[PDB]
Amino acid sequence: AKMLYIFDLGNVIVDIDFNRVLGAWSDLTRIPLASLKKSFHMGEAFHQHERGEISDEAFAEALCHEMALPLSYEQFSHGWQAVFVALRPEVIAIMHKLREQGHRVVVLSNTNRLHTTFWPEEYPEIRDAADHIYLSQDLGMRKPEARIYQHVLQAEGFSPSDTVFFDDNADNIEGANQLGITSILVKDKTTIPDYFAKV
Amino acid sequence: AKMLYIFDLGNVIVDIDFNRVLGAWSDLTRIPLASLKKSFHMGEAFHQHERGEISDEAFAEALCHEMALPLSYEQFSHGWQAVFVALRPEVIAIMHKLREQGHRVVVLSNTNRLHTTFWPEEYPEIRDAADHIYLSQDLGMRKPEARIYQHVLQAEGFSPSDTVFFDDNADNIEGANQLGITSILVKDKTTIPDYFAKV
Ligand SMILES: O=P(O)(O)O[C@H]1O[C@H](CO)[C@@H](O)[C@H](O)[C@H]1O
Ligand SMILES: O=P(O)(O)O[C@H]1O[C@H](CO)[C@@H](O)[C@H](O)[C@H]1O
Numbered sequence A, B: 001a002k003m004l005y006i007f008d009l010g011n012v013i014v015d016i017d018f019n020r021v022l023g024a025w026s027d028l029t030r031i032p033l034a035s036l037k038k039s040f041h042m043g044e045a046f047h048q049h050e051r052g053e054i055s056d057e058a059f060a061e062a063l064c065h066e067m068a069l070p071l072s073y074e075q076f077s078h079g080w081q082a083v084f085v086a087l088r089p090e091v092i093a094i095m096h097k098l099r100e101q102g103h104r105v106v107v108l109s110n111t112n113r114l115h116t117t118f119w120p121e122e123y124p125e126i127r128d129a130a131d132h133i134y135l136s137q138d139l140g141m142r143k144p145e146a147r148i149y150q151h152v153l154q155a156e157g158f159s160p161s162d163t164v165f166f167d168d169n170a171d172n173i174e175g176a177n178q179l180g181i182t183s184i185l186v187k188d189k190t191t192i193p194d195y196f197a198k199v
């Protein structure tokens, strides 16, 4: 009985920290890091950029306006590229193992990649570990929208009861739950190893 | 009796991995990562760039020629910015502790930073933990040259016997040893904690 495993990317397959991006912008503009952190809000520009509805340049524009950043696109993108990203090799190992057992393994990420940046979903380690990588920007959809989960289920050909989904965001978990997907909130680095050790 | 502690940066205060840079360049140009790794040599351009003797653009030029990379400066710099860097918080903690004990704490790094990149020596965590950061590009000198160590000793006003130097590079250790500096090869993450626990 082959299963579909859907893994969140950010804070699930990788550790990711945007404080390094703000550090880069602070260093360039001399605007204190704390001031950048205070004005760094997830709002409409994020939701739209993630669904591919506004360009990288428009996304960069909106953030720079909101944060009073006097940056060119190149400077914005350079800072963005500095994002801290560390693989969780224990998760990669599980993904490889699930696949050699014949289970379907996919990634589902709301991505803010730019055309100018090398981003985690493009990392060979991650690309090697998954059958398919579903990205919000390619689909025109984002978690926690019902439609994104439905799109994955249809594309992969799995019913909700044959599907297991890991994500560290409660809204994302709720959105998948509503479709009857078995959804496990990732609380920390122990959640996924514990799940796959303990049965 | 106040001491001078000199800490290497790369692979001593931080973990650093240029494979992520090559990954970025590979992703952009489609040239296989392995081919980039094979042609990524530390040669004259590195030595010169580290001492500030050639520009960022000239450094980028030399590497792109050597590796057959069809990149603009911006693309080169963007890839370079992607370098993996993780703090070793245990080292930062020691640096803060040594200073509150009244000892002198400095960093000594052969840096390949670009004017366009946010680089580890600029990280507030590192800047907060050191009295001074000595960078090869600012000095026109590089480890393992006798002159760079001498410059630090003179600037800080410490004799070699009052100085302790940590670096993971054997040539760097040898170069400091020759001036009578107590020099500890950093073999791994345990070397520095062990040194400061065990007396
Ligand atoms: O962006 P993704 O891969 O959906 O997922 C990530 O987004 C946020 C920003 O990176 C993180 O804080 C979330 O915890 C994580 O799942
Ligand atoms: O460049 P730095 O800070 O002198 O030091 C670093 O240089 C190299 C490249 O990053 C590393 O492999 C060395 O191990 C490290 O000490």
Ligand SMILES: [Mg+2]
Residues within 6 Å of the ligand: A114, A115, A116, A117, A118, A119, A122, B027
């Ligand atoms: Mg890319």
Ligand SMILES: [Mg+2]
Residues within 6 Å of the ligand: A027, B114, B115, B116, B117, B118, B119, B122
């Ligand atoms: Mg800088």
